[PDB]
């Protein structure tokens, strides 16, 4: 089978810009036999180009693809503020039919830092015996960013479960969170607890902490 | 035009077996020069493909799946169903149903165009139960230049979705829902969080809205700072 | 074999207008079999057109060729400066295959004329019984010139080297030198030097020279 | 992507071979619809074709080439080889390792692309030499408008190349080095001049600093003006 | 054999307009066999289009043509100084071959009238017993126009010639003149000759005559 | 790039032959895929075709002229040749010779690039005669709102061409040439006539230098206003 490799793994660019896609195949595609797809979050995916020169039926002039071999591309000329999605390159030149691994598009904008909060647990949870301690960041830019949690000056592994929402639409810019679950008797035992965050737009990495019990 | 719904279950034990139904309208299964098949796409991942089917009864599917797979179709009321068998948790996607191309000369199965709604599955034992509502009472640690945060947590809640809605729908500004993620137990939790000024804490007591369809549970719970 | 031809040998243009390049060919190409390839100075070459219509993959829209029979052009709608560089033709209609001459392209300049300078040979030189005459050119244009060297009023023949530095990349003008070389013996019994230059923008040619021995 | 490195000695004496290997990376040269050539660019001229080889051993060679050039491919390794004798000064040049195109019906070898890095080759008997600097020292019959002109002469050096700086890089602006040019004897020779201010020839003393990795030779100079 | 017909038989615009011509056959072209040609008065022809769509080598690209069956066109995208020259269009579908008639293009011009002026014959030819009167046209256009001689009140006919000059390139305008040949018999015994001109920018007929032996 | 160039006598008698030479460089005749034939276009009318040759030998012709047209080819000396006999007034024209195109499978005539530089031909038993200039003088009748015209007249003459200039080209303003008329008597005439100033006429007295080469007469002509 053949496996396609789509490249950039995200793509950043400001509104009006021009943005290329790559899907290279790892051995020889015949007849030119590609397809691109184009899915916006959270709905059924959309024919945009097949046989990698051919636009589908009502689709916008600005979408245009090209290539041959191993090497396909697709090219908008003028970006558009709902051209921000994945897409998703097909092969169908030989037998079983795979698809790529999809290439999100998001709104470039300027640096922008974490405001790191922290919440101590509540004492409705405290009393069914589970204890969870969450720290936020909100309205960072860009998306990457690592966070670890410390007991008592000790890493914690196995046992951070992280989220983060969708870009947003006003401001365009992430929301990250790390939760940290503990059952009673843990969360007791222990008395000091801080969640760091490292991030581009942070010269150092900025701690926010707080101590158990403390009105 | 040429139209396609599905029709499942939408949540199954493991082991059993998994029906799915996708019914065409605007066109003809019989009369025509398309294949129909199934797609699927895990939470967070890419495309998969599935199978497919033809009016005279030849199926194709994938090889990672020719073992579980199984396609019919009733030309008769103008369907085509899928019957995956020995589910898993790792099963669990949104399934699409689609009108596949295909070459005349050979057969086989072209690109994918047009596509059906979707319906995802949840492939789990766990048993319906209701919200655990908490709320993360602000405090000087959450506040930054006069900018307050504070959210209503939701935990041990199955299956989705869940609704939290600030002030009946009358706050939106600043609102932040965090997409549920699955516990070690195999329950589902998730954190709504909307920052307000500082100087407003003690002017307005905040309300977080929950509401859980599954088990028909309504909860509204109201947050305050702690007292300590 | 089929002999390509190139002209003009070099091309001279201001940034941003259209340079049309011919690849004229002494038979029949079968096929509109020609490609072209782009090299720059010290780099290996690479490939911009094949077919003399196909454009390569990741090439510049800017780039197209055109032709039938035994007339080929490359035309590129408007220049860069990364533009100005060697270009070849290959046919590839009938075995065995065959290159063109080349056709380099450079950034055309208001007409500027040389500086000559001379220097005596040096002392350290001279104790090994050989001695070095080096007549400089600074910053001309075109590049363009004739040089000699006469001893004692006598034309010097099969004895002097010429070598010209690449176009500046800020004031886009060479620098020709010539050089010498002779014995011990030679360089001792002659007592005048003279370096002549001949160029567009002199009116009439300019002569530098020195005397031997004179502080 | 696909990418192909050269490999070979640089210096070999007149009439003996040339033995020169590719190595592709990023593709197999088995499976695969492409053939395996050499190109060569001797010095201020155009690029000539040498020979070809496809997977299954079958060669071509230029008429002109035909009797001395030998390709060698070895599936095994990912490699393909060259193999020119009676080598004469007339083959000195930079060789290439491309990935040649063909057609299908006949096998014939079409267009050239990717290229290689490239690995220039000399052939000439001169043994390994140092440099012998010289001054060009400034003078009135170099200073013109108030701005002099002064110079730093290399001669009978091999091989290439001369690394020649001023001030240890401190100066850059007006420095120019000239290409080197072969001489009779077999060696070559470059002189790099600066043009400076006059007035500034009694205020800094220039120092002009040769370096040469052959020979593992450096060696500075200074240029002041001559005391005649 | 296939006739060609082209139309307008004059075409008229201003520099920079937009020119299409016509080229009509008698009977089916097959595979598209038309060519088209452009001749400067004086020179040559050249090839411009063959096929009716493909344009030859070094044509510049505001020359496209088309069309298929037996209607085909030529059109010029912008007309430029050198433009306004003969075209001519072929036919090899069916042998034999044939041309068409040829479509001249001008310039045009704002309406302008002709200034008559009349010439009496010269004494020395009129003693070789040849006479022979002429009335010249300055400065008119369009280029159509008619003279008539007469001879005491008596038209001409059989008798008259007529010579018209090429457009002219700085006013664009033409100059027509008849000469009257008669031998010495004829104009002695006639006393009274008179050159009318009718053209558009003169409302009504101007005429101007002299009297024979009017010092 | 190829050329062609034509050769022949210019001036033949009505009812002998009219031989013309077609001299092709940078193109060999024998090595290429294209015929070479003759057009010709009679003064103020169209082109018309009149035949081919191939390397082979084998010609086609006008099937109006195909009893009087003979083509050859000589691919030694690279030239082909017209032969035209019967001549008449009517076949006066101006004669080229191009490179015909063809279809491989049917080897019929298609476009005729490039073409050559045209040689024209007159067909008339007239002998050769010098030009009889008379002037045109000024006078009130041409003279109209301040500005005067004046001529100098040219006729019977034969053959063309005669060149008209006004005081040695010093005067180009103004200056028009009528183009010749041919006459019943078989004598060309034509008339120049230039607009002057009639302010003008009374300081300068113009000057019609009127020249002939085929009968090596050189004659000037002043024209001044009428003394009656």
């Known amino acids: 089978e053949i496996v396609l490799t789509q490249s950039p793994g995200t793509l950043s660019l400001s509104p009006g810009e021009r943005a290329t896609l790559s899907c290279r195949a790892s051995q020889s595609v015949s007849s030119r036999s590609v397809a691109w797809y184009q899915q916006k979050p959270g709905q059924a995916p959309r024919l945009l180009i097949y046989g990698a020169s051919n636009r589908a039926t009502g689709i916008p002039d600005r979408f245009s693809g090209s290539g041959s071999g191993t090497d396909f591309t697709l090219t908008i000329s003028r970006l558009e503020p709902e051209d921000f999605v994945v897409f998703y390159c097909?092969?169908?030149?030989?037998?079983?039919?795979?698809f790529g691994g999809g290439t999100k598009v998001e709104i470039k904008r300027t640096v922008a830092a974490p405001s790191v909060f922290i919440f101590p647990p509540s004492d409705e949870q405290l009393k069914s015996g589970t204890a969870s301690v969450v720290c936020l960041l909100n309205n960072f830019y860009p998306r990457e960013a690592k966070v670890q949690w410390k007991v008592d000056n000790a890493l914690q592994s196995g046992n951070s479960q992280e989220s983060v929402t969708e870009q947003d639409s006003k401001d365009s810019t992430y929301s990250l969170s790390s939760t940290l679950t503990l059952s009673k008797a843990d969360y007791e035992k222990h008395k000091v607890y801080a969640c760091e965050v490292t991030h581009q737009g942070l010269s150092s990495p900025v701690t926010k902490s707080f101590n158990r019990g403390e009105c | 035009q040429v139209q396609l719904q599905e029709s499942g279950p939408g949540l199954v034990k493991p082991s059993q077996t998994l029906p799915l139904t996708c019914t065409v309208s605007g066109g003809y299964i019989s009369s025509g020069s398309h294949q129909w098949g199934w797609i699927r796409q895990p939470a967070g991942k890419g495309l998969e493909w599935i199978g497919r089917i033809y009016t005279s009864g030849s199926t194709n599917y994938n090889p990672s799946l020719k073992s579980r797979v199984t396609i019919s179709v009733d030309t008769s009321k103008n369907q085509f169903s899928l019957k995956l068998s020995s589910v898993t948790a790792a099963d669990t996607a949104v399934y699409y149903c689609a009108r596949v191309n295909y070459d005349l000369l050979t057969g086989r199965a072209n690109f994918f165009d047009p596509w059906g709604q979707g319906t995802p599955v949840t492939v789990s034992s766990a048993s319906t139960k209701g919200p655990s509502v908490f709320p993360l009472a602000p405090s000087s640690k959450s506040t930054s230049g006069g900018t307050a945060a504070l959210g209503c947590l939701v935990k041990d809640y199955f299956p989705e979705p869940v609704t939290v809605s600030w002030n009946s729908g009358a706050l939106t500004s600043g609102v932040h829902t965090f997409p549920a993620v699955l516990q070690s137990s195999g329950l589902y939790s998730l954190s709504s969080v909307v920052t307000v000024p500082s100087s407003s804490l003690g002017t307005q007591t905040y309300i977080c809205n929950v509401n859980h369809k599954p088990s028909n549970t309504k909860v509204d719970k109201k947050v305050e700072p702690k007292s300590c | 074999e089929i002999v390509l031809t190139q002209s003009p040998g070099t091309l001279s243009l201001s940034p941003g207008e259209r340079a049309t390049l011919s690849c004229r060919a002494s038979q029949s190409v079968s096929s509109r079999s020609v490609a072209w390839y782009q090299q720059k100075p010290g780099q290996a070459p690479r490939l911009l057109i094949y077919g003399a219509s196909n454009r390569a993959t990741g090439i510049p829209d800017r780039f197209s060729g055109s032709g039938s029979g035994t007339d080929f052009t490359l035309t590129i709608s408007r220049l860069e400066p990364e533009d100005f560089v060697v270009?070849?033709?290959?046919?590839?209609?009938?075995?065995?295959?065959?290159?063109?001459?080349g056709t380099k392209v450079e950034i055309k300049r208001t007409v500027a004329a040389p500086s000559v300078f001379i220097f005596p040979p040096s002392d350290e030189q001279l104790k090994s019984g050989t001695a070095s005459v080096v007549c400089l050119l600074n910053n001309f244009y075109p590049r363009e010139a004739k040089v000699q060297w006469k001893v004692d009023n006598a034309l010097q023949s099969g004895n002097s080297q010429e070598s010209v530095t690449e176009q500046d990349s800020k004031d886009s003008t060479y620098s020709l030198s010539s050089t010498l070389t002779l014995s011990k013996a030679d360089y001792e019994k002659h007592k005048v030097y003279a370096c002549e230059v001949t160029h567009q923008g002199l009116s009439s040619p300019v002569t530098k020279s020195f005397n031997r021995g004179e502080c | 992507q696909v990418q192909l490195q050269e490999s070979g000695p640089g210096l070999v004496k007149p009439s003996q071979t040339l033995p020169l290997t590719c190595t592709v990376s990023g593709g197999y040269i088995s499976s695969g619809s492409h053939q395996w050539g050499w190109i060569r660019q001797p010095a201020g001229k155009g690029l000539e074709w040498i020979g070809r080889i496809y997977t299954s051993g079958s060669t071509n060679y230029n008429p002109s080439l035909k009797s001395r050039v030998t390709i060698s491919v070895d599936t095994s390794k990912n490699q393909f080889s060259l193999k020119l004798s009676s080598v004469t000064a007339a083959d000195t040049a930079v060789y290439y390792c491309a990935r040649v195109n063909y057609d299908l019906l006949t096998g014939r070898a079409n267009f050239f692309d990717p290229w290689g890095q490239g690995t220039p080759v000399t052939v000439s008997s001169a043994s390994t030499k140092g440099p012998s600097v010289f001054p060009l020292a400034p003078s009135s019959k170099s200073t013109s408008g108030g701005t002099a002109a002064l110079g730093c002469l290399v001669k009978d050096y091999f091989p290439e190349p001369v690394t020649v700086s001023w001030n240890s890089g401190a100066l850059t602006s007006g420095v120019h080095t000239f290409p080197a040019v072969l001489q009779s004897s077999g060696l070559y020779s470059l002189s790099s001049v600066v043009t400076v201010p006059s007035s500034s020839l009694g205020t800094q003393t220039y120092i002009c600093n040769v370096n040469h990795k052959p020979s593992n030779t450096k060696v500075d100079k200074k240029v002041e003006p001559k005391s005649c | 054999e296939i006739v060609l017909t082209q139309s307008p038989g004059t075409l008229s615009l201003s520099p920079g307009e937009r020119a299409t011509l016509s080229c009509r056959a008698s009977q089916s072209v097959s595979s598209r066999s038309v060519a088209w040609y452009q001749q400067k008065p004086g020179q040559a022809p050249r090839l411009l289009i063959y096929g009716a769509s493909n344009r030859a080598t070094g044509i510049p690209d505001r020359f496209s043509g088309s069309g298929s069956g037996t209607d085909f066109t030529l059109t010029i995208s912008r007309l430029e100084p050198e433009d306004f020259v003969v075209?001519?269009?072929?036919?090899?579908?069916?042998?034999?071959?044939?041309?068409?008639?040829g479509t001249k293009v001008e310039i045009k011009r704002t309406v302008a009238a002709p200034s008559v002026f009349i010439f009496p014959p010269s004494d020395e030819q009129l003693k070789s017993g040849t006479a022979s009167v002429v009335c010249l046209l300055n400065n008119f256009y369009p280029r159509e126009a008619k003279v008539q001689w007469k001879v005491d009140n008596a038209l001409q006919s059989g008798n008259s010639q007529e010579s018209v000059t090429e457009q002219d390139s700085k006013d664009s305008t033409y100059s027509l003149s008849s000469t009257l040949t008669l031998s010495k018999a004829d104009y002695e015994k006639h006393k009274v000759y008179a050159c009318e001109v009718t053209h558009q920018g003169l409302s009504s007929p101007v005429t101007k005559s002299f009297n024979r032996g009017e010092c | 790039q190829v050329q062609l160039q034509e050769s022949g006598p210019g001036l033949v008698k009505p009812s002998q032959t009219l031989p013309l030479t077609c001299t092709v460089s940078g193109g060999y005749i024998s090595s290429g895929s294209h015929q070479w034939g003759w057009i010709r276009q009679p003064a103020g009318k169209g082109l018309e075709w009149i035949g081919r040759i191939y390397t082979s030998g084998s010609t086609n012709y006008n099937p109006s002229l195909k009893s009087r047209v003979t083509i050859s080819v000589d691919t030694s000396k690279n030239q082909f040749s017209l032969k035209l006999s019967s001549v008449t007034a009517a076949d006066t024209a101006v004669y080229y010779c191009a490179r015909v195109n063809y279809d491989l499978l049917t080897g019929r005539a298609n476009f005729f690039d490039p073409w050559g530089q045209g040689t024209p031909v007159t067909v008339s038993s007239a002998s050769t005669k010098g030009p009889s200039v008379f002037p045109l003088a000024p006078s009130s009748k041409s003279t109209s709102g301040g500005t005067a015209a004046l001529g100098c007249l040219v006729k019977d003459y034969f053959p063309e061409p005669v060149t008209v200039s006004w005081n040695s080209g010093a005067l180009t303003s103004g200056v028009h040439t009528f183009p010749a008329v041919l006459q019943s008597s078989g004598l060309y005439s034509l008339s120049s006539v230039v607009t002057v100033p009639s302010s003008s006429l009374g300081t300068q007295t113009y000057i019609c230098n009127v020249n002939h080469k085929p009968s090596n007469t050189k004659v000037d002509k002043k024209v001044e206003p009428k003394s009656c």
């Open positions: 097909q092969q169908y030149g030989s037998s079983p039919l795979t």
